[model samples]
Target: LMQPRPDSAFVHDVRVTWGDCDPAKIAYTGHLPRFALEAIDAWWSEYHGPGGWYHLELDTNVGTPFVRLEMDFKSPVTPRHILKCHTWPTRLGTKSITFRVDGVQDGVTCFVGAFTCVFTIADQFKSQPAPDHLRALIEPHIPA
Candidate 1:
């Protein structure tokens, strides 16, 4: 079971930079994924404590590799906008975690997406079930 409300989500503010723009002078279609990735990593750090994702990789030798990623854009985002991106765990499996991330600007959603990440052993690059400790750590972030 999850805690602190199953429908809860985490938020991160992204300041769109020049590099994030494209020839159109707005958010690059390709760069949105990086924003989402960084936000999710920040989510892990915010919830998983001090070392965050880096710690998980170095200390536990466990790495989360993305198996699936999907994104939808609602508008052309620009550097002038501060994107408020929200992320949360939508599903938890024995060896995988599905996270949903949404980016909004001026109360309008500019992007919405989800990613499936599989936990693995860093050394051998083999898929494995998440550790109990890890599962417990993720439980609180599950949104549904």
Candidate 2:
């Protein structure tokens, strides 16, 4: 897992692959969600370990599930283009955190998105406060 340094945000770079594009040779609109998730995964790994989010589940018996997602596509990402995914916790409350993600490729933003995830008790679907351990893991990366 990559450790989260004392940076303002978590930024991950990914290369556009053939599998991510369509017949038009541009990244499929629908693939943004997956890319966003991958960025989040990378961010989490930086803090805790590989599968760090899953570790949180074992420790707190809670999971952060997306309640809402909103994204805007600005440009087309073509094969071989390197995209940067910048993510940070924009808002953190007792039971939820909102993440803002920006996808940039070729020096231009290709997409902007936000995700709101609520921490819920495993198996019960009951919302709960963000656990201290989990909060500690993510707090450093939250933007001021």
Candidate 3:
């Protein structure tokens, strides 16, 4: 069984499929955002229960949408590689959460990404303060 990264608050693993790469077999630049989102969603489910991002975003009309994104690619990964995405909150604001996701392969960081997500009222799409309940979950991931 694959073991998740030790220090990560949330970890998601997925193999680099053939469709995930270019003709050269190197991962396409677009893979970063797509996989990063997948990791975020999985993290929500892992700790926040079976209530997936869908339920929270659609059912409750509360959601977090990315407002900013930054990425750095170190070594390119191929379809043979399996990526371990380590995700954690780096900053917690009144209505936003800053996160960093590191893609690791063979104990080395292959890709690094930072993101800022603003909590919002889904339909109206206005900023909404993160609730107390959500704060509790985010706090543990925040850097001290």
Q: Which candidate is the best by TM-score?
A: 1
TM-score-better candidate, 2 vs 3: 3
Residue 5 error, candidate 2, Å: 16
Which regions in candidate 1 have their CA more than 4 angstroms from the true location? 1-7
Instruction: Compute the lDDT for candidate 2.
Output: 0.78
The positional error of residue 105 in candidate 1, measured at the CA in angstroms, is: 1.2
Model 1 Cα lDDT, one tens digit per residue, 8-104:
6788899998888888898889889998888888888888865757887887788999999998898878888799878888889998998888888
lDDT of 3 by residue, 29-130 (tens): 887788877787787777665666887788778789889988788888776667888987787878788777888777678888887888988889888998
lDDT of 3: 0.78
Runs with alpha carbons beyond 4 Å of true place in candidate 3:
1-6
- Distance from true location, Cα of 133 in model 1, Å: 0.8
Query: Distance from true position, residue 52, model 3, in Å?
Result: 3.2
Worst 10 residues of 2 by lDDT: 1-10
* TM-score, predicted candidate 1 vs. hidden true structure: 0.89
- lDDT tens per residue, model 2, 9-107: 678888789999888889998887888888887877777677756765666477888898888888887766788888777778887888878888877
Model 3 lowest lDDT segment of ten: 1-10
> What's the true lDDT of residue 47 in model 2?
76
- How much is the lDDT of residue 92 in candidate 2? 82
lDDT of each: 0.82, 0.78, 0.78
